[PDB]
Symmetry: D2
Subunit: 253 residues, 4 copies
């Protein structure tokens, strides 16, 4: 079982990694990626292997608080190393979000969400759903979230928490003015498979596109397209940790 282990950068994350590397290691051709740190560290491990997501099972270990991705306690590593080498383990697939920027295309993959902000002034775009105009937005920005990313930025924006077994994407508003000229729906929008949300600029055409907090200052933007990606992220399932339990322990104590 060719595997590969990432680390945050602290002493503990670099130490426990050595405690697991003792019990083949391939960083170019991995089948088992073990993230050590938190959810942010897990995101970096995801972006490191986007091209080969269809051949990789991910495992998250938190050296800090309980994360929706990094859930395994550091003490579980001694039992985690033996079960992964056993060869017998079932995978769990979560949907992903595809983000295309038009000018020559520019595709992106997101595990949490992909937000579109402004590069200084107001954010004014036209929301086009399946080649049909829906609304003209004005405010801070917009947020298209993955089912697993709903518990992140999406929830803080007033989004709905949906179970990752649902193949869809959720669009939420970011401080919409919502007046006569720029009447927005207000409510979060959940789009299924093969549904495309096309963001079209009115002016400016310079937006701050952020994919999992990786915010790039895109210039000369003519179109931004969102859709449920065909590629799915696989998790190595050993124990039983229900999604709603993880949500309960996070926000409801």
């Amino acid at each position: 079982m060719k595997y590969m282990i990432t680390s945050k950068g602290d002493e503990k994350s670099d130490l426990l990694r050595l405690n697991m590397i003792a019990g083949e290691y391939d960083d170019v051709e991995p089948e088992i990626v073990i993230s050590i740190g938190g959810d942010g560290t897990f995101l970096s491990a995801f972006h490191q292997y986007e091209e080969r997501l269809d051949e990789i099972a991910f495992i998250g270990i938190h050296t800090g608080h309980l994360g929706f991705y990094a859930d395994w306690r550091p003490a579980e590593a001694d039992k985690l190393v033996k079960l992964l080498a056993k060869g017998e383990y079932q995978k769990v697939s979560y949907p992903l979000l595809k983000t295309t920027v038009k000018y020559k295309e520019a595709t992106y993959l997101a595990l949490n969400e992909s937000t579109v902000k402004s590069s200084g002034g107001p954010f004014v775009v036209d929301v086009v759903i399946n080649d049909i105009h829906f609304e003209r937005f004005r405010g801070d920005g917009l947020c298209m979230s993955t089912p697993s990313g709903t518990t992140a930025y999406n929830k803080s924006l007033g989004g709905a928490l949906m179970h990752p077994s649902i193949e869809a994407m959720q669009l939420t508003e970011m401080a919409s003015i919502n007046n006569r000229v720029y009447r927005t729906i207000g409510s979060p929008l959940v789009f299924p498979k093969h549904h495309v949300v096309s963001l079209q600029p009115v002016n400016d055409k310079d937006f701050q596109i952020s994919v999992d907090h990786l915010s790039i200052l895109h210039r000369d933007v003519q179109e931004i397209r969102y859709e449920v990606s065909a590629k799915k992220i696989h998790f190595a399932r050993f124990r039983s940790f229900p999604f709603w339990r993880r949500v309960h322990d996070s926000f409801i104590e």
Copy 2:
């Protein structure tokens, strides 16, 4: 084939109804016992009544909605197109689109009651405070206190669910959404706040705390349930069937309702 038409009650619906019935005088016969096509004329509430009127044979009935007033999400056919609809289904040249439904189970302390919802199923209190425990898949999630709770169908998300601050879902997604009704997050009764979208095979159980009397409403059919032990929510295996002739996208229909 066999068909029937329900009416809202106003002159506009009953007159338009008789005008369409005479149009089937094709190989169409009127029958309100075992129909193959059911036409609703009036509003969404009129359509909901036609749903429960024939919720015993949903798998053999195609519904068609006609709105005499403003645009509805079920009744989306304008009375000006009533002429074309008669000939269209007369030849049987149309497709079939299915939307998910919601199953509501009420257990007492006895038997049990099962209900089907096209819009949503809401549970409020019989006057005083509404205090229950939210159980998801035999696992506790929160203790709710406030007015009530709302479990919505994907197609019903644009109804009461939206006004309660819920999220809109496309009716091709087989799921259900739970939204709060004036919850009081005062450290004693911590709730999630955010709407919760549950997939298939997931069971959301509402278990009472002190009071055991609840006002359970299924698509605005509220009847008092005394001595309730459990209220279970899950996506029904039964599906409503529409007879879409043209192409009226769900999101486009949302745009014409709220955005315009």
Copy 3:
């Protein structure tokens, strides 16, 4: 000083009530439930609301005092163990009065005559069956046409109650105003509403006018009664204020802190 005490009805409240009465007996304190100058509410916020409505004609000659036998309330903020020190401060008259604004609700019919109600928390208006459809007229000028469950006008002190659960803003009771909050507005193109909570100052009148149905379920501090053939429902900050006998200094924001955050 004429006084009286209301009780929640449980063992603890009734017991504490009797001992407090005997405590006042040691001083110049006369018991009177007809014309009291001091009204003590032993129980909760719900018990406090009953005591308020019990004497809503003598609000000026009365300084209310709340005692909570259970969890902390925004009105009943005195612990039962402090009932002994409460008497000794009341008997001497060693206290100052703090006033909170109130909400006036005026109901007009097809004139049988008229009806006015005072609210300490809020006043809600809903339908008696179908949809709730009214025109919101702010100062003789039409603002919006509403459709949904209803509308809730809250007092500053009542913002921590039903108002907060409906997404309303929390106001400090020193501010003389009122807050209108929506109750499940459909908010479409036909019935476009503001969505946001509205805070109206004094001398501002919010008029609710029927569109079709004239039967409305009006609830003042959860005293819900059915009003038929309603012509108009007016909202405005009353000139009457509830008075509290202040001894210590319990911050309103701390009461919010202890109730919704941690304590």
Copy 4:
């Protein structure tokens, strides 16, 4: 008396500006762009915001007038076509005052006067402690906090879910910005309205580098120890000629404007 006119930038705001300056020359009206008694803004609310900060040291002897070249503004409520009447009414000689927000930053004590709001973001994660009148209230974590003026409730505050407050009420409102409310960081959620003499002290937790924006004048402050909020004694004055109610401007902005 002395007057001046500020312009947006486009030809529309400049052409209308010159037209007014000419008309006032026919009346006894001195022209000073340094020490005026009357300041006229042409363009929009953003143009008015600039006209406020440009002369925020002489708010005592200045009555502002707003003219919207585009859509209706809450500070620019006069129409371009009504400019001819405006020149006449200002030449012949009521005044309305709105509350202002005082933003104090301690690292040197910097003072800021906001007409709309004063937001505080981070630089990544924004984490501060909220202190109200020398006592702890909550520990915030999210995008940031927004303290708004009564007249500024219709701006960023409304978009953040804040309540609309009439300018007659001398107060300030605090709203959350994408707050993550969980076990560790439990916030109130609801917007908070503060009366006069009430001080909201924002004190850092982790990093001392916060982005402070007073009326879109985003300035990165370094080594901040405390950010105070209070209802400023300074009040912006307006010139009244025609009754244009605050709730009307709210209606004509967010609801509908049938006569336009």
